[PDB]
Design a protein around this nucleic acid. Structure first.
Ligand SMILES: [Zn+2]
Ligand SMILES: [Zn+2]
Ligand SMILES: [Zn+2]
Length: 87
DNA sequence: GAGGCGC
DNA sequence: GCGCCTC
């Protein structure tokens, strides 16, 4: 369905319309060209990795699974601090 | 938990 | 993207 891809560095966001890709491309500007697109958020980042990491707060994606319990985290550093509970 | 950023 | 500071 989505065939219109942003080719900006580290982005890859795809759109169903040329209309939408066009207006998205306008956001890649300034000191922080990685704008979170979550409704009402408004955060902006200098680096793509920072946006990717941030955006898990909105989706609840938690790929860092504790091997000693059923808890999971959005970030490696959070998992590493958690693991101290198993000492 | 989440943002900044050196690596 | 991890790991460390910082808030
Ligand atoms: Zn883009
Ligand atoms: Zn956001
Ligand atoms: Zn655990």
């Amino acid at each position: 369905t989505a065939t219109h891809t942003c080719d900006y560095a580290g982005c890859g966001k795809t759109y169903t319309k040329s209309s939408h890709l066009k207006a998205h491309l306008r956001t890649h500007t300034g000191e922080k060209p990685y704008h979170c697109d979550w409704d009402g958020c408004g955060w902006k980042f200098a680096r793509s990795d920072e946006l990717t990491r941030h955006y898990r707060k909105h989706t609840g994606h938690r790929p860092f699974q504790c091997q000693k319990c059923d808890r999971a985290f959005s970030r490696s550093d959070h998992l590493a601090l958690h693991m101290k509970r198993h000492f």
